[PDB]
């Protein structure tokens, strides 16, 4: 019943052809098949991991950790403040730190939610559209609020109950290099999910796309039920908020940004002015020495696997994995994973090395 199905499906996984038929029958009896709708989260970062997954149809996207955004109320200015560090990989190895200093002030006169101290967890995947000739960035992002212990007996939030279209506009000036970016896409606050594509409309971007991610809509963060009273960003909608930043690149220049974030009709719009000063023309930013996505460069399609890191290390999921298309999965529980690795040292090696490479 399920076995004839999983037996048919397991043919799409060439890793298992490293296996005799009697044993393969036993493995297929332990596999569980799953159809996953396009866009759905399969594994969430920080969750415990009791199984791993083999892709039989479709592809999945891995979104890796970008860090935490630490937020505090600014009750006297009726807004919030945030500070955090971004670690950009340098292409030859090493890291370029970007220290972020942030303040947000509502545009409207009405009261907003002024939160207790908390943070936003961000995971991201950066990619390219193989049919796009312009300089561009395709971006997938998950944003989750956390840091308030869950005791256990805003009107702006109802603007984000579904999928909201987003428009992003940036005029930049870095060491006199002027440039513009336009981006469009959609925000799903219910799942904390951003999917956008950005174009440099003036030609070649004079800085690396990863350094513009933070500047290019925290109102799409998923605030958990017990934290809805701490979501300043949605509470200031629809009139919106001003968001300003100082971004200090260690041993290099600084970005200063001012943005208007607000609804125009049904569309959440983010309009940005950015000025960069004191950059080194042969440094990591103006010299384009930062990795775009070498860490995590591809969706994982048929024959690939994920979820193996937690089973090897015992640590929680290190990344969020979501279906890019409709996905057909076979999952394998932890205990049967250890037996698979024991029965086939070849397969054990493939897992070991892949998990190392991904670490
Ligand atoms: N840089 C990466 N490239 C590809 N896949 C990854 C990367 N980082 C994590 N993963 C996968 O994402 C999974 C998330 O859950 P696990 O940590 O159990 O195991 C992880 C790997 O399978």
Please give the C-alpha separations between residue 42 and each of 2, 111, 264, 354, in angstroms, as whole numbers: 21, 38, 33, 19
**Which structure tokens are listed for 164?**
């909201």
Nearest to 189 by CA among 166, 215, 216, 169: 166
Q: What's the CA gap between 154 and 10, in Å, rounded?
A: 48
Nearest 5 degrees, angle CA 131-CA 137-CA 139? 110
Nearest 5 degrees, angle CA 68-CA 305-CA 38? 70
Nearest 5 degrees, angle CA 132-CA 294-CA 51? 110
Q: What's the CA gap between 292 and 287, in Å, rounded?
A: 13
Q: What's the CA gap between 108 and 240, in Å, rounded?
A: 7
Nearest atom in ligand 1 to the alpha carbon of residue 52 is 18
Q: What's the CA gap between 96 and 91, in Å, rounded?
A: 10
Rounded distance from Cα 301 to ligand 1 centre (Å): 14
Q: What's the CA gap between 7 and 25, in Å, rounded?
A: 8
Q: What's the CA gap between 27 and 33, in Å, rounded?
A: 13
Nearest to 283 by CA among 206, 180, 212: 206
Q: What's the CA gap between 37 and 244, in Å, rounded?
A: 37
Look up tokens 């860490």; give the residue: 295
320 lines ligand 1 (CB under 6 A): no
**Which structure tokens are listed for 282?**
């042969």
60 lines ligand 1 (CB under 6 A): no
Ligand 1 pocket mutation, candidates 55, 87, 309, 353, criterion most atoms within 8 A of CB = 309
Number of residues that make up the chain: 359
Q: What's the CA gap between 329 and 302, in Å, rounded?
A: 9
Longest dimension (CA), the chain: 72
Q: Which residues contact 235 (CB under 8 A, 6 or more apart)?
A: 112, 113, 154, 155, 156, 157
Q: Which residues contact 167 (CB under 8 A, 6 or more apart)?
A: 182, 183, 184, 264, 267, 268, 269, 270
Resolution (A): 2.2
Nearest to 217 by CA among 267, 173, 180: 267
42 lines ligand 1 (CB under 6 A): no
The percent of the chain in helix, strand and coil, each rounded to the nearest 5, is: 25, 45, 35
Nearest 5 degrees, angle CA 136-CA 191-CA 355? 70
**End-to-end Cα, the chain, rounded Å:** 38
Contact (Cβ atoms closer than 8 angstroms) between residue 107 and residue 123: no
Report the SS3 class of residue 257. Answer: strand
Cis preceding linkage at 186, omega within 30: no
Contact (Cβ atoms closer than 8 angstroms) between residue 302 and residue 53: no
Q: Which residues contact 124 (CB under 8 A, 6 or more apart)?
A: 63, 64, 66, 139, 140, 141, 142, 213
Q: How was this structure determined?
A: X-ray
- Write the DSSP symbol of residue 74: E
Contact (Cβ atoms closer than 8 angstroms) between residue 329 and residue 43: no
DSSP bridge pairs for 164: 187
309 lines ligand 1 (CB under 6 A): yes
9 lines ligand 1 (CB under 6 A): no
319 lines ligand 1 (CB under 6 A): yes
Look up tokens 């296996």; give the residue: 19
Q: How many helices (H) and strands (E) does the chain have?
A: 6, 17
Ligand 1 pocket mutation, candidates 292, 295, 297, 358, criterion most atoms within 8 A of CB = 358
Q: What's the CA gap between 56 and 82, in Å, rounded?
A: 42
Q: What are phi and psi of 221, to 5 degrees?
A: -60, 145
Q: Is 136 left (phi over 0), alpha (psi -120 to 50) or beta?
A: beta
Contact (Cβ atoms closer than 8 angstroms) between residue 122 and residue 319: no
Nearest to 327 by CA among 9, 8, 4, 3: 9
């Amino acid at each position: 019943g399920d076995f004839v199905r999983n037996w048919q499906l397991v043919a799409a996984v060439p890793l298992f052809q490293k296996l005799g038929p009697a044993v393969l029958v036993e493995i297929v009896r332990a596999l569980r098949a799953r159809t996953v709708p396009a866009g759905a989260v399969i594994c969430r970062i920080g969750e415990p991991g009791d199984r791993m997954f083999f892709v039989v149809e479709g592809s999945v996207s891995v979104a890796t950790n970008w860090g935490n955004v630490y937020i505090t109320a600014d009750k006297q200015k009726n807004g919030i403040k945030a500070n955090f560090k971004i670690r950009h990989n340098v292409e030859g190895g090493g890291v370029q730190l970007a220290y972020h200093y942030q303040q947000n002030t509502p545009i409207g006169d009405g009261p907003v939610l002024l939160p207790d101290n908390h943070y936003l967890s961000v995971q991201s995947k950066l990619s390219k559209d193989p049919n796009e000739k312009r300089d561009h960035m395709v971006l997938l992002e998950f944003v989750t609020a956390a840091g308030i212990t869950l005791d256990e007996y805003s009107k702006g939030e109802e603007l984000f109950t579904g999928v909201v279209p987003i428009l992003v506009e940036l005029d930049g000036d870095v060491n006199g290099h002027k440039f513009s970016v336009r981006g469009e896409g959609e925000g799903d606050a219910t799942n904390g999910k951003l999917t956008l594509k950005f174009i440099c409309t003036t030609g070649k971007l004079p800085v690396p796309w990863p350094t513009l991610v933070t500047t290019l809509v925290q109102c799409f963060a998923r605030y958990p039920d017990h934290m809805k009273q701490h979501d300043f960003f949605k509470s200031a909608m629809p009139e919106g908020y001003i968001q300003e930043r100082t971004i200090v690149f260690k041993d290099d220049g600084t970005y200063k940004t001012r943005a208007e974030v607000k609804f125009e009709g049904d569309t959440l719009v983010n309009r940005i002015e950015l000025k960069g000063i004191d950059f080194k023309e042969d440094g990591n930013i103006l010299g384009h020495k930062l990795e775009y996505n070498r860490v995590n460069p591809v969706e994982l399609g048929p024959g690939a696997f994920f979820g193996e890191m937690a089973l090897i290390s015992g640590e929680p999921r290190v990344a969020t994995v979501s279906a890019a298309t409709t996905v057909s999965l076979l999952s394998l529980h932890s205990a049967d994973f250890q037996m698979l690795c024991s029965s086939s040292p070849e397969i054990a090696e493939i897992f070991r090395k892949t998990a190392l490479e991904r670490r």
